[PDB]
Amino acid sequence: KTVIKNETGTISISQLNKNVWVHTELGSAVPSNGLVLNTSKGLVLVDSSWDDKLTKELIEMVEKKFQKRVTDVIITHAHASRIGGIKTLKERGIKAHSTALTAELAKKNGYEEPLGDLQTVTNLKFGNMKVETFYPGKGHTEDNIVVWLPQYNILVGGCLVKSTSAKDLGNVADAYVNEWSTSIENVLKRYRNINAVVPGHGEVGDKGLLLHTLDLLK
Numbered sequence: 001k002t003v004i005k006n007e008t009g010t011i012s013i014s015q016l017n018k019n020v021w022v023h024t025e026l027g028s029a030v031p032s033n034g035l036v037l038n039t040s041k042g043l044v045l046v047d048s049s050w051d052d053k054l055t056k057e058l059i060e061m062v063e064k065k066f067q068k069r070v071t072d073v074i075i076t077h078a079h080a081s082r083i084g085g086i087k088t089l090k091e092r093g094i095k096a097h098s099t100a101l102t103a104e105l106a107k108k109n110g111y112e113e114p115l116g117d118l119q120t121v122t123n124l125k126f127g128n129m130k131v132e133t134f135y136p137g138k139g140h141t142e143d144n145i146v147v148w149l150p151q152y153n154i155l156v157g158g159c160l161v162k163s164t165s166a167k168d169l170g171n172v173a174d175a176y177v178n179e180w181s182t183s184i185e186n187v188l189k190r191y192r193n194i195n196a197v198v199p200g201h202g203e204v205g206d207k208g209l210l211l212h213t214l215d216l217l218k
């Protein structure tokens, strides 16, 4: 349960295992989760943060702690909490992976564009760490993807998946509340044995988070 914070408390990292940490940052207090993957080829993040200021501080914190460079980031949809640090990634030579749809939504909303290199299912490998990206369909947004670590049976649900303490769906202005249930069932069908589920906001849980989200959709 190792947790490491910055001075202000606005950024922390919590270890899930030897090589996998959750990163959490507070936007102004509104927390957002992503992952830090400690691989033999460098650090890989799932999602950046709310803005360039937090993204820079997050990168500098993990580079110092883990003593390697952030080389890659997976952006799970085109909202500020996920893509807000894209300028920083691009100017530092950090590869920002996304689906084609996320990239064009980024451009549409005036953000710099991530790579658009992810397909519906993409299998990546960073050093010895295997990473699968999966587009399950529309939900929280039209473009939301989930990230699976097959060596750990860890799912990063992103904002597609609500934490136990969430009592509503959050901001639904860009959401597809009919499709969202089917998209969650697609995740449950694909990943039948889940060890941990990381929601976009709130505490890490298990498969029960996906069932909770279905309940919130009723």
Ligand SMILES: [Zn+2]
Pocket (backbone or CB within 6 Å): 077, 079, 081, 140, 141, 159
């Ligand atoms: Zn969002």
Ligand SMILES: [Zn+2]
Pocket (backbone or CB within 6 Å): 081, 158, 159, 170, 200, 201
């Ligand atoms: Zn969210």
